[PDB]
Amino acid sequence: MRFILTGVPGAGKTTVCNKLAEKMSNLSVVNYGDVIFEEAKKLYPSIIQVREDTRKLPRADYRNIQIEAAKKISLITDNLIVDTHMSLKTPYGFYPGLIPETINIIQPDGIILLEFNPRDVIARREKDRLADMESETDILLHQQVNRMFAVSYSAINQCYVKIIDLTWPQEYEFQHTEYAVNKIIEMLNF
Amino acid sequence: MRFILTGVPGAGKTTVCNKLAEKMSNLSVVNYGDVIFEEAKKLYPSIIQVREDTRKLPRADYRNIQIEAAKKISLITDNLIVDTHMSLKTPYGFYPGLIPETINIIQPDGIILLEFNPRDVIARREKDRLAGKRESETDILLHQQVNRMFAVSYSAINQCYVKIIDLTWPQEYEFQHTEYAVNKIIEMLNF
Amino acid sequence: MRFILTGVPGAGKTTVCNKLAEKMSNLSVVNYGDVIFEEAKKLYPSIIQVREDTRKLPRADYRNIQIEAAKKISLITDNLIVDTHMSLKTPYGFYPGLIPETINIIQPDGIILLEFNPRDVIARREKDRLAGKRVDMESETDILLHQQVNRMFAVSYSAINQCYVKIIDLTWPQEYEFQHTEYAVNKIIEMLNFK
Ligand SMILES: Nc1ccn([C@@H]2O[C@H](COP(=O)(O)OP(=O)(O)OP(=O)(O)O)[C@@H](O)[C@H]2O)c(=O)n1
Ligand SMILES: Nc1ccn([C@@H]2O[C@H](COP(=O)(O)OP(=O)(O)OP(=O)(O)O)[C@@H](O)[C@H]2O)c(=O)n1
Ligand SMILES: Nc1ccn([C@@H]2O[C@H](COP(=O)(O)OP(=O)(O)OP(=O)(O)O)[C@@H](O)[C@H]2O)c(=O)n1
């Protein structure tokens, strides 16, 4: 099956992705941003070198890069999970991290939203930073906006909208990760 | 005045639809789900024998039976209410009951959303279950919120009304919620 | 850059618009409804005496009037702020204040939503009723519902056309009068001049 996987940044989504790729063989976990960056360097090497450089392309070139990345991802046969962000915050507001062509090419079966507790998000972000400074309301608003984006994409393309709740206190560290991964594989095997 | 009536399952939507069909003249109350089930069954008599078996069909064939159901119920003239669910929950999450083709084929004027109180919903569901006629507060409220989002998206795309009848208040007597909703819908139709 | 400023009516949106016009140079602030009314009067002077008379129209002609108003608004060159509504409460429910033709013709860089505290909304509605004209009055929950529906409309237009969705929070309590207006104007200006 095919699912997009999303959530606010810095909350532990990458750990979920890697522990999924670790605890299932018939699975492919890919990052839309990584494929976008690869296709960009291959088509526009004279300009691109790091993720940060993907901003300098015009919106038409960036759209074509997203389209080609979605295509290359489309040629995957096994159970697929596409890690990405539905919305990202900017000085102008929330900007969608996807485009309708992405979904109608990848044609995923569903969209999975990892909804964490804002306090936990702040804690994880601060920890990883010691290795942006939002508040609880900012993160809650971001998650509700992501809900709305997912529901819009679903209404347009008719797909599933799974909301995985990780807003409960962990009994042991990294438990949210295991709960998310176990429920995701339960979905994949049914 | 053709409207799409929706709400979380097991809360009282069907009683509202029935009392509408009984109290309103020149009003056709049609169940999108039953029509889809019938059409799918008759066009694929081998693979389809229960309602939720309609998920095995490939994307194209399911969308085609939905298109045929929408065309069939669009032929109805005058005023009609379409009983249906805007989203149903499954092991894979929330799944929509409509598609843009369905909406612009039925070309409805508005979408009515019956938003109940989750406690009332739990009570109704269990009372029905005990009578052999067939989630948590948080889950029900999330379902209603995603239904609201779906309805707003459909309205933004097709330009239609989004009526939200709020039955979250405690009843003073049985069937007060459904009576209030039916009367609001009838004053809407007559307006 | 082009932004569509919106929010529930009677809460101070036009105050923000007029003060933006008064503070920042090279900023054109246009009211979609005003343009629509002018064009309606132009093409149908036999029926349109005032704004509400626009209900007399059939929906197709009014939609085309909206399209012509959006066209005229798109002809503007520099920084633009289109004051309008994402939804309107009617007997039949919420109706979108925009149409897809508006989004496509204006190509707005973003949408902006002023989210108020319903108490302030009600108080300002009743005050502007007292001190002047503007002859179904809503409640707190109704206003919250309206704001959430507008948020959903905005996210939908963004997901469909890929534009920004800025939410300016004016829910906190004002320490002095018109503080929300100053805050909204300052934030919109900071956003426009961002480099
Ligand atoms: N249950 C968890 C999951 C994650 N973390 C911490 O939170 C951060 C996770 O970051 P990451 O998974 O990389 O965040 P994303 O949401 O995936 O976004 P980005 O690529 O920007 O990091 C790390 O410090 C990780 O140790 C944690 O403390 N407890
Ligand atoms: N105001 C109400 C509305 C409903 N009910 C009870 O709730 C059930 C009616 O729900 P129904 O309208 O049948 O819900 P559906 O929309 O039919 O949901 P489903 O498809 O799951 O049945 C019946 O037990 C009815 O007595 C009630 O007690 N008071
Ligand atoms: N921070 C603010 C902003 C506005 N107002 C009051 O709110 C009233 C109504 O706001 P208005 O300026 O009329 O803005 P709109 O919301 O755009 O009104 P309408 O939709 O009726 O045009 C005004 O009289 C103004 O004094 C206020 O008290 N405090």
Q: Provide DSSP, A71-95.
A: HHHHT--S-EEEE--SEEEETTEEE
CA distance C191 to C188: 5
Q: How far apart are the CA of C8 and the nearest CA of chain B, in angstroms?
A: 16
Cβ–Cβ < 8 Å for B97, B51: no
CA distance B150 to A109: 17
Name residues whose C-beta falls within 8 Å of residue C90's C-beta, 6 or more positions apart in sequence. B161
Question: What does C106-160 look like in DSSP terms, one character per residue?
Answer: H--SEEEEEEE-HHHHHHHHHHHHHSS-------HHHHHHHHHHHHHHHHHHHHH
**A99·C162 Cβ contact <8 A:** yes
Cβ–Cβ < 8 Å for C157, C103: yes
Cβ–Cβ < 8 Å for B30, B23: no
Residue A77, Cβ density class (10 Å: 0-12 exposed, 13-18 middle, ≥19 buried): exposed
Cα A124 to chain centroid distance, Å, stands at: 17
Nearest ligand (C-alpha, residue B130) = 2
CA distance B58 to C145: 38
Residue B25, token pair as written in the block = 């003249």
Q: Which residues pair with C83 in a beta bridge?
A: C5, C31
**B157·C153 Cβ contact <8 A:** no
Q: Taking CA B166 as the corner, what is the angle to CA B165 and CA B171, rounded to the nearest 5 degrees? A: 120
The length of chain A, given as a count of residues: 190
Directed axis angle between helix A118-130 and helix A136-157, to 10°?
A: 110
**Quick count: other Cβ atoms within 10 Å of Cβ B101?**
15
Q: Is B150 on the interface with A (CB under 8 A)?
A: yes
**Minimal Cα distance from A152: which residue of B?**
B153
Which residues form the domain of C112?
1-195
Q: Number of folded domains in chain B?
A: 1
Q: Taking CA B154 as the corner, what is the angle to CA A89 and CA B136, rounded to the nearest 5 degrees? A: 75
Report the nearest-CA residue for atom 19 of ligand 1. A10
Name residues whose C-beta falls within 8 Å of residue A122's C-beta, 6 or more positions apart in sequence. A134, A135, A136, A139
Strands C79-83 and C27-31 come out as parallel
Q: How far apart are the first and last CA of chain C?
A: 12
Q: How far apart are the CA of C133 and the nearest CA of chain B, in angstroms?
A: 27
Ligand 3 atom having least distance to the Cα of C179: 1
Cβ–Cβ < 8 Å for A69, A56: no
Beta strand spans in A26-141 (E): 28-31, 80-83, 87-90, 93-96, 110-116
CA distance C40 to C42: 5
